[PDB]
């Protein structure tokens, strides 16, 4: 199965990282950010797929309920890689000001996408910690 990859500096405050791969939207994780409680643009969380595969879509749930429900990136991108070094942006998002809580990011790739790594990546500094609930691919 895909394995979790994320910015090394984050620390788990609540929940467990395996909660991001259990297929349940109601289990997630609350990451403490360093740099003065700030997630820098360019930080990320996503999946190492173990080998190059053809993806038909993703379903990533960001945020969670209760604690840290408001702790989410405002601007971010979905990007993929063959080698964990060079990245291609599938799509960008700006959800500045959106309600706190779980937010399902679900995409279908009309033309399947060949990737070994797929992740969500911060595009703007934010003075928040971070919550997420689930990362899944469709292939």
Ligand X SMILES: CC(=O)N[C@@H]1[C@@H](O[C@@H]2O[C@H](CO)[C@@H](O)[C@H](O)[C@H]2NC(C)=O)[C@@H](O)[C@@H](CO)O[C@H]1O
Q: After which residues is the chain broken (C to N over 2.5 A)?
A: none
In the complex with ligand X, the residue whose CB is nearer, 31 or 117, is 31
DSSP H or E segment with residue 37: helix 34-37
Identified binder of ligand X from the candidate list 22, 37, 94, 106, rule CB under 6 A:
37
Of residues 20-59, those binding Ca ion (CB under 5 A)? 22, 24, 27
Indicate whether 71 belongs to the interface with ligand X (CB under 6 A): yes
| Smallest separation, CB 30 to ligand X (Å) | 7
Identified binder of Ca ion from the candidate list 29, 134, 135, 137, rule CB under 5 A:
134
In the complex with Ca ion, the residue whose CB is nearer, 18 or 82, is 18
How many residues belong to the chain? 139
Task: Look at residue 19 and give the partner it binds from Ca ion, ligand X, none, a contact being a CB closer than 5 to 8 Å depending on partner kind.
Answer: Ca ion
- Residue 112: half-sphere exposure toward Cβ, Cα within 13 Å: 10
| Smallest separation, CB 32 to ligand X (Å) | 7
In the complex with ligand X, the residue whose CB is nearer, 2 or 67, is 67
In the complex with ligand X, the residue whose CB is nearer, 57 or 67, is 67
Residues 87 and 89: their CA atoms lie apart, in Å, by 7
Q: What is the 3-state secondary structure (H, E, C) of 59-127?
A: EEEECCCCCCCCCCCCEEEEEEECCCCCCEEEEEEECCCCCCCCEEEEEEEEEEEEEEEEEEEECCCEC
How does strand 44-62 pair with strand 11-15?
unpaired
Positions touching ligand X (CB under 6 A) are 37, 68, 71, 127-129
Positions touching Ca ion (CB under 5 A) are 19, 22, 24, 27, 133-134
């Amino acid at each position: 199965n895909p394995s979790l990859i994320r910015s090394e500096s984050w620390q788990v405050y609540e929940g467990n990282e395996a909660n991001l791969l259990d297929g349940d939207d109601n289990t997630g994780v609350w990451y403490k950010t360093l740099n003065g409680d700030t997630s820098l643009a360019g930080e990320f969380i996503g999946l190492d797929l173990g080998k190059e595969i053809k993806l038909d879509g993703i379903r990533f749930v960001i945020g969670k309920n209760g604690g840290g429900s408001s702790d989410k990136w405002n601007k971010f991108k979905l990007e993929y890689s063959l080698d964990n070094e060079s990245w291609t942006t599938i799509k960008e998002y700006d959800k500045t000001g959106a309600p706190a809580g779980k937010d399902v990011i679900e995409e279908s790739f009309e033309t399947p996408i060949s990737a070994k790594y797929i992740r969500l990546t911060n595009m703007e500094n934010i003075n928040k910690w971070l919550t997420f609930s689930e990362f899944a691919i469709v292939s």
